[PDB]
Design a protein around this nucleic acid. Structure first.
Lengths: 263, 65, 158, 206
RNA sequence: UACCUGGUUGAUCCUGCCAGUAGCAUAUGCUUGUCUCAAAGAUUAAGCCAUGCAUGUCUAAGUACGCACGGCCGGUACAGUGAAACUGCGAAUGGCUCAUUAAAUCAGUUAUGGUUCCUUUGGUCGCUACUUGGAUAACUGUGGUAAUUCUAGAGCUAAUACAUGCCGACGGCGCUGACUCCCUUUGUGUGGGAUGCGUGCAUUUAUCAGAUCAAAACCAACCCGGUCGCGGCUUUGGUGACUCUAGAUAACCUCGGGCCGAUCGCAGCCCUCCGUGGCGGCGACGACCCAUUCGAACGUCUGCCCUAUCAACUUUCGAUGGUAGUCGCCGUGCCUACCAUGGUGACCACGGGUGACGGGGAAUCAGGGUUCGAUUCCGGAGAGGGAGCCUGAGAAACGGCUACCACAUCCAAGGAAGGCAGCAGGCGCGCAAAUUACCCACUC
RNA sequence: GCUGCAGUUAAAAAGCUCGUAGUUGGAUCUUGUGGAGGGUUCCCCGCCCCUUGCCUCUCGGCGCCGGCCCGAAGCGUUUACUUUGAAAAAAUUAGAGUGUUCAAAGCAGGCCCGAGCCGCCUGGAUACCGCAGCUAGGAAUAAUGGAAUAGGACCGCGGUUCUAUUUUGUUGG
RNA sequence: UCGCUACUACCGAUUGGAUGGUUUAGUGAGGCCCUCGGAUCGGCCCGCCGGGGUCCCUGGCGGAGCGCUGA
């Protein structure tokens, strides 16, 4: 029977992009309730144990966090299954290093090291606009942040930049044609291109057409488009491969020609 | 009960349909004697890997160049 | 028309009020009731008979308390012995894949039809959209009526 | 116990259905409030999600609006006179939404007479002159009579209410749900609603 | 590897079936050296169960007068380790089985503009008071019954348990209008103004406003550039679509029965300042309301095995629909009153059967197919059979409670106690299925 | 036995005829020269007669010295079909890489001096995922439709009734 | 056709037997809701004594009404 909410996760039921092995276990870490959806996050334990390899077991992760070393968006978090997600920054002040979560072009989180002056801000997509009591205007972002008194030009689907020490808005990018974006869901996940057309339907879903640096074309539902730069230039540094999504025949040929992986 | 095991496995040979075909019996024994094998199953393994190779090449030859 | 209060309780539109002040009209008069009506969206148009009419119907899309959302469908008017509701027929082909051949099937829907449509007949074509549950078996409401792509009511001069 | 499910009853075709599961708690129902006229008795119940709901068993007083005059005040409830749904509800005096009731006219009369500087409910001079004339006439420097044309040129009430005010009672309609809110509360009957219910009241018994 | 062979006659050519040949999964017989994997009381009986275990929990930070153990001596609230008990949280997840169930469950697809939501994360948190009240548990002391995780009478004492309730920061702004001053006795244009009443967000009801467009001509009175007839204009946000969001007015308000802190732990400070007025650094715990996250619930479209030795069926004993209401978290014949006479079927309704839980899937396979799916992932249902209900954000819960029905244990015959389709183990059944072992090291 | 069986005599065509549902249903309504890729004429532009078939606005950028032009929109009589986008758990199946000592499996692993490298490189692909719903091109085949008790259209006129309440300097008439 | 030995099914007296589902009429445990009930337990009003003070606070003994008022 199901008389209330569930609190376990089977390892074959867990999100594919975490890359968990088949044979160590029956269970996987259930992500803690928080700012990002269960299908769309990376639990902090998988980042420290499986990606960075600073710990060999979940107990070695627990005694890294309880020493207060780990910051997410500039706040110290002691919870080992906290749901980190897209555009967040992780700082490890004791080893002296900083990371940002961004998609690899195969649709998984890359490790991406950043300089300490770039670790001071993040980019946020707008979800909602509304007016409260005494006529005060409010804004809501993709990561549950609520802001009072936004600039009256900031509309739906726009991108805003915030400083992490104060949480207030600094600058913004309008959703319109010719701006650079990244794709955050569907089959096109982890690709980058410029917006070239928006096609709209009254009821059901709008569709956006996007163009690559190499001149390829692709499309997706409007809910999967995140804007990252005015015109041709991004407001964030980008990982190896820059979102170009080369095919399996091109990938074979570079792997043979470059002789990488200790050939 | 749930368990951390896995259950994937497969067979690596097939038995012939005619058990006592005279033309088949001495052909298989000549391959055993020339290559120094233990039994008939050790020949039926090699016929099965060749059949799977030819089954794949016959599919790819249907598609456009 | 000339009377509408045929029920045991008084019938009126919500959100409309009549002032009992400045009531003088002389030897003649004008309508004591203004009319409430709305736009449905989705490129539909509100009938003249809803704006110029005097009927009360709470389940009406144009002049009552319903929201049009989800699927839009069409079918053929086939029975109308109930009051403010009708039955429509939907016909389709089902594919059976062992054979390479089709099978004819049908379903019926009960739908709500307001006044403002008043010349519908059996064999007319009707367009409908989803609502909240309106009664036990009713989930859809009439948005448009037509007799295009078919023969006339009476002779060809209609 | 009592339940409000859809699965106990038959489908469009006339065919039966068999039970899918035992009764669930979210399918629940409870007995009716049956609110009477009498001094306040209210009880409270815990509801799904841990919220509270108020159930009125007896009420003597309510809040009513005279929408024509923009006046609303706390008022005594006297009697019930019509119910569109069932005659046993007026025979046993039970209070529900869209019930028709009699209320005390006094707080509306006192607002009107002090606002317009005119009498309303009065029969003859013996109920005008001997007391409370000093509500109507006082010293009013440059506000005495002509400046009250802002009042006097729009003071006339409908004939159907001036006949009610002389008897000390008005007809009103209940707008709240008393078995759900704990309150009995509504508006004064006027115009064609008043003509409709006066015909229905007279045609039933009179 | 897209395949056949024996058998009707005195002999021949056919039809047609029987028998052979290969795989797969249940039982069973004979036989057995090494090494890596690993199914296993589903089929019959969702039949019955001796014994043991399977759910508990404390930090610098709710309550420490346990001589229980202890220090250099002292309570300056009071040290320090701390059994017990009170308070808080969890026990609604996990694990087991497949009886019921054929438009039901379930799958793909869509919707809440028809609802609720512990916790996390972000907003919000100023219409006797230098600190109030009484009363229980652990403990001490005296008992009752054949008997249980049974409990009674007496003496003490706590709070983040239970119950009260200020101070500070009212200085709001609208409505009344004694009087008073100026052009014009009134009306009508003014500026002051004694004095009363209401005045945060939630709650119930009623009312108001929501601005934009095309073209002139007269008249009362004037904005304004100017003076005794002409130029020129202005005001929350949002959806395909709201009786949306925000705003204004008149009242209500829940009280014993909505919010706005009588709480706890670390380092100390700055001064009309000698221990005073405060202001303040880091927190911990708590609570009303938005938005999130995890969901749950209800609804849309299309999809099902055999059967006519099942052809008509449903219908105030609610069947289909309308109007008003009750009940409910909310839409709705969900239920009640009044009214209408409807709704489904040869394109198979209604009725009956199923060694029927649905799906991802599995065996065999030239191409097309046939058969299977109790079973590790996902959804549903149920804890001997039916029914009712407490607590809580969440249950109609069974390692919770109350009763009837079927079994059955102890007794001093008055009474008391019970639920292995959890893990091992036993009886019964049958062709048919393993140890009453070790550990929280790994995964959670 | 759909692909794919059989019914004179081996098993098997109702004694005969009518007929509602079901399945099936005759012919017909716009083409060749020129250029690119490729050939020695036909698939993309523009044309005998129409090439998105029409059209003229207005909120809204372009081209140039106001006016005239070229991308949305009304939309092309309605559907099936076909080709293309989007969106659909993982494991299983197919399939790429990789000397578990080989293999069935697994998701790993590979370079370099000595230990002074306080290390470096690299994988965890990809396809399939009926039907039903969503979407943009094609127009053969098969459904479906318009004026015979004449209506399409012109910057065309006329009587009469309803009526938003704009443009005027506003509040009122 | 009649006769001998095996094996399977049919008809049927018997008011047969066991198990299960529908359903008329009568009875009805136990919970929840509503209208009543009131065992027992407190406070605030009238003496005396004591601590503080310009007869009241407030601890205690104690009796009449056991008023009024709460659980």
């Amino acid at each position: 029977m199901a008389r209330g909410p569930k609190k376990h996760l089977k390892r074959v039921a867990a999100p594919k992009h975490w890359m968990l092995d088949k044979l160590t276990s029956v269970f996987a870490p259930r992500p803690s309730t928080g700012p990002h959806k269960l299908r769309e996050c990376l639990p902090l334990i998988i980042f420290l144990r499986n990606k960075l390899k600073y710990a060999l077991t979940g107990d070695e992760v627990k005694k890294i966090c309880m020493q207060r070393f780990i910051k997410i968006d500039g706040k110290v978090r002691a919870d080992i299954t906290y749901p980190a997600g897209f555009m967040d920054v992780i700082s490890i002040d004791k080893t002296g290093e900083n990371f940002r979560l961004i998609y690899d072009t195969k649709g998984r989180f890359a490790v991406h090291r950043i300089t300490p002056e770039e670790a001071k801000y993040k980019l946020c997509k707008v979800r909602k606009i509304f007016v409260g009591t005494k006529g005060i205007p409010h804004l809501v972002t993709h990561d549950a942040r609520t802001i009072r008194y936004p600039d009256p030009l900031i509309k739906m689907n726009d991108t805003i930049q915030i400083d992490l020490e104060t949480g207030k808005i600094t600058d913004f990018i309008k959703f319109d044609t010719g701006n650079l974006c990244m794709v955050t869901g569907g089959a096109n996940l982890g690709r980058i291109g410029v917006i070239t057309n928006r096609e709209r339907h009254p009821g059901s879903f709008d569709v956006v057409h996007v163009k690559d640096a190499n001149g390829n074309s692709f499309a997706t539902r409007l809910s999967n488009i995140f804007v990252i730069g005015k015109g041709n230039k991004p407001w964030i540094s980008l990982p190896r491969g820059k979102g170009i999504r080369l095919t399996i025949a091109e990938e074979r040929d570079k792997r043979l020609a470059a002789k990488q992986s200790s050939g | 009960m749930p368990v951390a095991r896995s259950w994937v496995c497969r067979k690596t040979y097939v038995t012939p349909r005619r058990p006592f075909e005279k033309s088949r019996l001495d052909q298989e024994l000549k391959l055993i004697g020339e290559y120094g094998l233990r039994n008939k199953r050790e020949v039926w393994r090699v016929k099965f890997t060749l059949a799977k190779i030819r089954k794949a090449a016959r599919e790819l030859l249907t598609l456009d160049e | 028309m000339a009377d509408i209060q045929t029920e045991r309780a008084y019938q009126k539109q919500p959100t409309i009020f009549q002032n009992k002040k400045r009531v003088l009209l002389g030897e003649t008069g004008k309508e004591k009731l203004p009319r409430y009506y709305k736009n449905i969206g989705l490129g539909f148009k509100t009938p003249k008979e809803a704006i110029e009419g005097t009927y009360i119907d709470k389940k009406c899309p144009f002049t009552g308390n319903v929201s049009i959302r989800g699927r839009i469908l069409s079918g053929v008017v086939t029975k109308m012995k109930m009051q403010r509701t009708i039955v429509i027929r939907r016909d389709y082909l089902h594919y059976i894949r062992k054979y390479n051949r089709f099978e004819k099937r049908h379903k019926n829907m009960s739908v709500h039809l307001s006044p403002c449509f008043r010349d519908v007949q059996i064999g007319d074509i009707v367009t409908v959209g989803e609502c909240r549950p309106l009664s036990k078996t009713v989930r859809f409401n009439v948005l448009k009526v037509t007799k295009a792509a078919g023969t006339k009511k009476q002779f060809q001069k209609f | 116990g009592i339940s409000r499910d859809n699965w106990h009853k038959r489908r469009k075709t006339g065919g039966k259905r068999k039970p899918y599961h035992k009764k669930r708690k979210y399918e629940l129902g409870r007995p009716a409030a049956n609110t009477k006229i009498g001094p306040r008795r209210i009880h409270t119940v815990g509801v799904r999600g841990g919220n509270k709901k108020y159930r009125a068993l007896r009420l003597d007083v309510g809040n009513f609006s005279w929408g024509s005059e923009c006046c609303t005040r706390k008022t005594r409830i006297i009697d019930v006179v019509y119910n569109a749904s069932n005659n046993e509800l007026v025979r046993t005096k039970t209070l529900v939404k869209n019930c028709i009731v009699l209320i005390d006219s006094t707080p509306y009369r006192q607002w009107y007479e002090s606002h317009y500087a005119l009498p309303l409910g009065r029969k003859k001079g013996a109920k005008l002159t001997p007391e409370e004339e000093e509500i109507l006439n006082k010293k009013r420097s440059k506000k005495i009579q002509k400046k009250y044309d802002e009042r006097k040129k729009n003071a006339k009430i409908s004939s159907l209410l001036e006949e009610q005010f002389q008897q000390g009672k008005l007809l009103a309609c209940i707008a709240s749900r008393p078995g759900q809110c704990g309150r009995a509360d509504g508006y004064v009957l006027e115009g064609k609603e008043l003509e409709f219910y006066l015909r229905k009241i007279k045609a039933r018994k009179g």
